């Protein structure tokens, strides 16, 4: 019945709206990109040489991140043309693929901290909403000489309901964030399954080259 | 764990409930 | 006073979220009894094949044992990865790079199987987190009725009030049954997955020892 | 922690105590 | 009241649980406490793993130090012919920390129940009291009395429930703390034993490699 | 109203309320300063990263970074790399060069991450203690309510209305000061984490340029 | 009025509560005044021996300093562990394994002495745990006796509950008197034992440093002339 | 007036005052530490050799902790005279500097746990004297007796004043402890920057000496 | 730190104190 109750109510409601909006957007985001990563890994698992892996990745599409990994590997081939130190090439390429896997894991992390802050702050605006709902459950009590609580038993009530507006907006999102802490935990390892294999496809094809340069 | 943040809320419920029988 | 009678004593939102409580509990028990017998069967199969391959002293002997391991036999998959690093690295002089790449692929596959063991466990930790808290929210809607009811009755006594008492007791005794076994089952699943990964790493280290000794004998014959 | 399970019990004590002065 | 007597019996059952856990855990602490101290005092002058086995030949089957030496002998025998000995040391340290943590976990049972009982007990005694206070305020609001003399026995037999909840709660807390400390000291001594085993394997592998260095 | 209930105060309610609102003003001012600061720094850093993503040797990176500006942190990283070139003149261990230089980059990225962290120490304290000082103002307001009862010496709900209600108002304003400080602190924590990650990307690029140039120079030496 | 007087005016269960509270308080005071001065003497001896051993330039020079440290000189025990790892490694070629084993044993001895410090602190933790508990039991017992006294009479006022409120809140008070200084003593013991373990880590670190110096100089003498 | 209530009042007062005094003393001394350390690091961030850093730090004062770090580095130079392994020198020096930085950081910790202790234990008493005064209020009103809320309120007010004094003792002690914690953390990181620079100096000169002695 | 274990005890003192004025 006062402006602060209404403002904290609409803040809790809009916070829950933004919560479920980011939830259902990033849900199909994670699902589509994880399914694409899984099927592209199952395609790339049959490569025996590096140019064979280029022939496998010739039809993956431009935003295929494993194709970008093979671009990284071909880039470390083409920058280091004319050298005799394959070991420094392998060290730099390992470091680059580490940083690219970490970079993709950072790009997946965007929007998650939004939900983390919302699920962390939603208890605090929720408890303040219970607070000002209690102030309105009150002062009219002692203004109108209310001793019988039966005329203010719906007045008391209902501040509890502001807790109810809190918790569903507050609690599972962090858990969803924790869900999104683990799916990315399933993602970055799965991505990490591929790129160092990109090393191995190089690591043999350099070692099969220099040994071919040995005899 | 982000779970024990309910404690201040518990305190707030309780010190609501100190005022209600008064 | 029965459970479904107290369910009749409540209203719509706590009805819906107690349905959510019991569905989360049922899927928790279902994931438990599925993954338990799955872990048991895979432990028996891995212990069987480990006691088989503990007698092998060469990689050719390991393939001769592994000729009848099965399609999804993980030790045969490890020997297939080792055979793949044999066949891809044909014509090289750096056996140590072969051993490094082989150990790296075996660490990769042990990590892959350890990730394969933990599919439902994310939902298990999810339920073990949320069960006291969804029990708290179900508590909140199930309790915002005694205010209304005794505002209706003007009667402050027994069975007017006491099914609300038994209603809250039921509404998070279900939360207890959803909360404590979920955490306990997740911790013992973490225990069994850790033991499975330890045994699998032992098997992979055994495969590394077999291929390393055979490559050392080949390099000593080359010298 | 298995400690915060007292909250529903607190709620139950409170919503006993709403009925007793009535 | 029958609900009051039901939570009385619940307090009694949790107390009997506390009694039984104290009995079983205390009789296993008093037996398996000093034996590992005596065996560590024996193995303080082992100086080699074979002489450690010569000391350990009479330790018995249930000697956990003898189990750790079984694990160490297992890692010796499984790794016969291994040129890499540091990997043997790493895998053996992994198995020993796994075994010591498994012993600490398997003797850490029965204690979370104690923590929960020592937490919950005065609270459910408090609700048994406040249900006695229900029967008291029912007497007040039905007999319309401003008299406390006709209603005091309900509140006294009520407060009996909180008293019995405190009775159940105190030894659970005490026994839980002292058994947690005894488990901590037990894990410390067992880690000392496993550390000494790692020292034995380190000494013998280093002296074997140094003997294999020059003939 | 708010100011009428402020007129219902004694001196300590006034002092804790002005402490609440001044801490709130400090919080919002810190936010609206550091927000546009972080936006400008992140914009410049992402732009310079997209510029330096095309460099292939270190002198090419000098050619690109000649116009980045004085406080360009990527140019500062290139200054550190040039310093480690000049201090390694006459040496023969490129691995030690890379160790020293990577270690300096670790320390400098840590230094810039500390440069980002100013004022957050105020924010964590304010967001921590603000519910507690709201509770303290609540306690003093409840004490003023009992002071008003001791002045009136009667038992009445109209007696206990204004002091209890103003203690409730102090409870509200304590949480009003409490919430956005925690908001802004978590916001800036995440943004500084992402900033340090992007700076580490830039320093990784510097290390890759240095490592390619040193290894191709060593390959040309043989 | 007087504490012996209100002890007389209290119920016998409340009397048992109060005597348990004051015995726990007395043993808390005793554990504090024991461990404070014992730990202070240990810290004084440790700082003395560290200021002595700060100028040793070889490990045998450290033995020459440590020949007159005393029986239970823990730094001398650290040097005994270092000499044990010297003597057990006779016939080896890896100095790094020596350093690993010795650092591991000395970290373990730091942990062992730090656990030997903590004898009696969990008594203090248990006291700080259950100090409100028996006092709350006597509190509820006294309020129950208040309602027993109201029920035994046929009238009521505040004069019946006032000795019972006195007993109840006084039992709560002595529960707090047992609670808070036990906590404070546990605070300062935990902190000072942590700093003591840190200083012991400094001393054993210096021991490892000296042994590393002598191993590196022996390797430099053995490798090149 | 109430005797045990007044005793815990003045105990909270003395605890609050010594938290004030610890704040002032540690603030002034640590501020001078920060000023001198930032000045000395801005001086030392320009040398090209360790002996050049000795030439810079010869102008420094006696309790210049960076000069103490250089003394530790010079001690590892002097104890390794005639040695052949530079990596052992670098490992010993790195571990000595980690040890010394940890020692300085623990010397920063002098008295902070008193602050943390008092900020923890403050909301306990105050409530203690509140309970004691409310008990005495019940005893006095019962031996005078009434059934209203009018007579009971001044004892409750005098009781809750002790709880207010407890909160006064509680909150700014926690404030001071956490700001000391994070400013000492930044101090430790700045000292780690300095000792890192010292390690880089000795590493540069060891590597250049090895490169000069490898090719005569 | 083994110091913050006093919180459940604080909660127990408080929810004693909810019952005593009733």
Residue numbers in the entry:
A (entry chain D): 19 to 233
B (entry chain G), D (entry chain H), I (entry chain I): 19 to 40
C (entry chain C): 10 to 232
E (entry chain B): 20 to 234
F (entry chain E): 11 to 232
G (entry chain A): 10 to 234
H (entry chain F): 19 to 234
What do the authors report?
The Ton complex is composed of three proteins ExbB, ExbD and TonB located in the inner membrane. It utilizes PMF to take up diverse compounds such as iron-loaded siderophores, haem, and vitamin B12 through outer membrane receptors. ExbB has three TM helices with a large cytoplasmic domain, and both ExbD and TonB are predicted to have single TM helices and a compact periplasmic domain. ExbB and ExbD together form a proton channel, and isolated ExbBD complexes show ion conductivity and cation selectivity in vitro.
Purified samples actually contain a significant amount of ExbD. To identify ExbD in the complex, we carried out 3D reconstruction from the cryo-EM images of the samples at pH 8.0 by single particle analysis (Supplementary file 1-Table S2). Starting from a reference map filtered to 30 Å resolution from the atomic model of the ExbB hexamer, a 3D structure was determined at 6.7 Å resolution with Bayesian-based algorisms implemented in RELION. Nonetheless, the map clearly resolves all α-helices and loops in the ExbB hexamer except for small parts of the loops at the periplasmic and at the cytoplasmic ends. The map also reveals three rod-like densities inside the channel, which likely correspond to the TM helices of three ExbD molecules. The helices fit snugly into the hexamer channel, with the arrangement off-centre and asymmetrical. Indeed, the rod-like densities disappear if 3-fold symmetry is enforced. We docked this domain of ExbD in the cryo-EM map, and the dimension of the mass in the periplasm is such that it accommodates three domain structures well. In contrast, each subunit in the fitted model (ExbB6ExbD3TM) is gradually dislocated by 1 ~ 3 Å from the membrane plane downwards towards the cytoplasmic side in the cryo-EM structure. The ExbB hexamer and ExbD trimer complex has a ~5.5 Å pore, which fits with the reported pore size of cation channels. Significantly, the cryo-EM structure shows that each of the subunits of the hexamer are slightly shifted downwards with respect to the prior adjacent molecule, resulting in a downward spiral of the hydrophobic ExbB wall that leads to the Asp 25 residues of the trimer.
